[PDB]
Structure 1
Amino acid sequence: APVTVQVAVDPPYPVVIGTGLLDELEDLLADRHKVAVVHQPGLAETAEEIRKRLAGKGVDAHRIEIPDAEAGKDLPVVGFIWEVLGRIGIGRKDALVSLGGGAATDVAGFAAATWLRGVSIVHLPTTLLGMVDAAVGGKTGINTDAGKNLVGAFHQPLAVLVDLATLQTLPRDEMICGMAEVVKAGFIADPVILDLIEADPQAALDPAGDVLPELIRRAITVKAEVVAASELREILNYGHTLGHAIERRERYRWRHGAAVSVGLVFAAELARLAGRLDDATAQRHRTILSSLGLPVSYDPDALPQLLEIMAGDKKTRAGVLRFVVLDGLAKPGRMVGPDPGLLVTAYAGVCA
């Protein structure tokens, strides 16, 4: 019944896409002695239902509620999760289930990665961004005093269950910000994603339509294929060089997807001015993103503060900025240490 995308790492794991996946979760974890469901607050009820269905099969099943959103990835939260796994007596053969957006899958994933040096985790992402991106690929992380996105671990999930029923209650604004990673996947490796969205941009956002389920499958496949195929993975940062800087500048008060959207537009203008990307494919970034309702511009006077921010990013070595750029649709390449005047000119092409 559901579609499954296999992530061809070693060992491989499935990303299951379908409607009503609790049965598949039950049969998957039926034989574990203990399971802890780590969930964000608005999902207490789905978590309690998972817990009961599990306890029904004989699992000593627990739910662990963590703060919503970015508050949920903070070091004290993972400290709390560890203490709870201990109190419950979660062992090496036991399992965690994450239920929530990207922050939940990241913190629950980091906790599973480090508890007894690694226990199995199943991810149930409940946001579009979580489904196409954060839950696939095994990157986990937490927020510490050092900054965000710095501390983490690679830890592949036993499985990822992408339950489309859950999209029916997702607010429109979260749907739109999840679509920025789908669009990114389209530009880097699967232009059919772009063609499908262009047919009708508003049908792409409809959790009941037939387009969104296909876009999800395709975006997950692009990520699965990149991850299975050590630096090709950097292509997934497309739009994120400026995007992460904007987020930071706004103190994480902008949606991740909105910042990436502006970063994509910037990356396209950078490539266009460098002579690497044709005008048509370059312009297509702004037209697709703006048609979905995503921002395509940012504060015209922010470049100096953005440059200083990008200066300190982990990828920056000896003050040298690195960007993912396209040499054509689905032909990702790199631009290392671009001339400052070129960034200034690209930024003006985006903001003015």
Structure 2
Amino acid sequence: APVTVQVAVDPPYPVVIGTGLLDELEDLLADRHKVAVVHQPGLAETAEEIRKRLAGKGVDAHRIEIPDAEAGKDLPVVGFIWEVLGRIGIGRKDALVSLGGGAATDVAGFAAATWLRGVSIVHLPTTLLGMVDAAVGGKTGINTDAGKNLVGAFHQPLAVLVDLATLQTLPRDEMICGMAEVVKAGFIADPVILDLIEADPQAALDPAGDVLPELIRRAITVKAEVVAAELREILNYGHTLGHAIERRERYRWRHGAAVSVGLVFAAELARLAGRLDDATAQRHRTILSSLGLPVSYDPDALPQLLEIMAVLRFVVLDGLAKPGRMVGPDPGLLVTAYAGVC
């Protein structure tokens, strides 16, 4: 029943996709003398059940609770984890387990990376974003005095367990958040993602349907191909304007909403440049709006956004699933593209 995607890295590691993955989690960490589970506030009950079940197999399983969301990622939360790993006596051969969204995976991933020079971690992402993006591929990031995610270590996890059952509690808004990243994968590597969504957009958003599991298999396949690959740049499709919008709105905008405007922008850029056909360009706008994602932003915001973007690089499409670059485009071309969008 459970599908797996191997990431072809040294050593290779699996992303496992299915429903109720406790058995698989047991198989992996049964031999570990100790295990700590870093979870967001809302998942304490799911944490306890991992701990109970691990404790059951003769394992000193512990659990640690971090602040939700972006606060679970500040440097003092990392300090906090460190101390606790200290008191528990977590050693070189033991393991961490992350339970939550991208923020939980980042911070736990960072702590694992920097504890005794790196200890095993299994990610159990529980947002769609965390599932298709944050948990896959070994980049970690934390929030420090320096900014957001400038600090972070590179550390691949032992495995990633993508348990579709966990999505049943996830709200519409966060589901739509992460779909923006999924659409991005559709345009840059796998157009079947696009056809699956197109066929019924509301069914794409239902965690209980046939469509979502396949969307996640595919978006994760795309990300695993990239990280086993500089091409890692393609995953920034839509993030140049995206991130600027996120900044300008002081992080109130859901990441995915900002990426969504970015994609529609990137598409207009490549269209005006004669690199992308009108039909594929227009398809950005129609897929994203129909999922409830934003396709426009304040038409007066461009000057402030150009300032934040501090020459510029964009990922553009040179045709469906053929990403290229545009480096230092003319400001007036950025103006014109912005108009068309906004």
**TM-score, scaled to structure 2:** 0.99
1:341: Cα distance to partner? 0.3
C-alpha distance after superposition, 1:266-309 (max 9, x if no partner):
10001101111111100000000000000000011111111111
CA distance in 2, matches of 1:277, 1:296: 18
Please state whether the residue corresponding to 2:35 is helix, strand or coil.
Answer: strand
CA distance in 2, matches of 1:305, 1:84: 43
Please state whether the residue corresponding to 2:15 is helix, strand or coil.
Answer: strand
Please state whether the residue corresponding to 1:90 is helix, strand or coil.
Answer: coil
Please state whether the residue corresponding to 2:114 is helix, strand or coil.
Answer: helix
Please state whether the residue corresponding to 1:325 is helix, strand or coil.
Answer: strand
1:149: Cα distance to partner? 2.0
1:154: Cα distance to partner? 1.3
1:210: Cα distance to partner? 0.2
Matched-pair identity in % = 100
**TM-score, scaled to structure 1:** 0.96
C-alpha distance after superposition, 1:83-106 (max 9, x if no partner):
111111111100000000001000
1:32: Cα distance to partner? 0.2
CA distance in 2, matches of 1:267, 1:138: 27
Please state whether the residue corresponding to 1:281 is helix, strand or coil.
Answer: helix
1:120: Cα distance to partner? 0.3
- Tell me the equivalent position of 1:193: 193
Please state whether the residue corresponding to 1:139 is helix, strand or coil.
Answer: coil
Please state whether the residue corresponding to 1:157 is helix, strand or coil.
Answer: coil
CA distance in 2, matches of 1:156, 1:305: 37
1:145: Cα distance to partner? 1.1
1:26: Cα distance to partner? 1.1
Structure 2 gap ranges (5+): none
1:182: Cα distance to partner? 0.4
Please state whether the residue corresponding to 1:320 is helix, strand or coil.
Answer: coil
- Tell me the equivalent position of 1:350: 341
1:260 aligns with 2:259: yes
Structure 1 runs (4+) deviating above 2 angstroms are none
CA distance in 2, matches of 1:5, 1:165: 18
C-alpha distance after superposition, 1:33-84 (max 9, x if no partner):
1100000000110001111101111111111100000111111110111111
CA distance in 1, matches of 2:81, 2:256: 28
Please state whether the residue corresponding to 2:116 is helix, strand or coil.
Answer: helix
CA distance in 1, matches of 2:158, 2:251: 30
1:153: Cα distance to partner? 1.2
Please state whether the residue corresponding to 1:154 is helix, strand or coil.
Answer: coil
C-alpha distance after superposition, 1:231-274 (max 9, x if no partner):
11000000000111111111111111111000000100011011
Please state whether the residue corresponding to 2:162 is helix, strand or coil.
Answer: strand
C-alpha distance after superposition, 1:215-236 (max 9, x if no partner):
000000000011112x110000
Match of 2:324 among 321, 333, 336: 333
- Tell me the equivalent position of 1:314: none
Please state whether the residue corresponding to 2:31 is helix, strand or coil.
Answer: coil
CA distance in 2, matches of 1:348, 1:153: 39
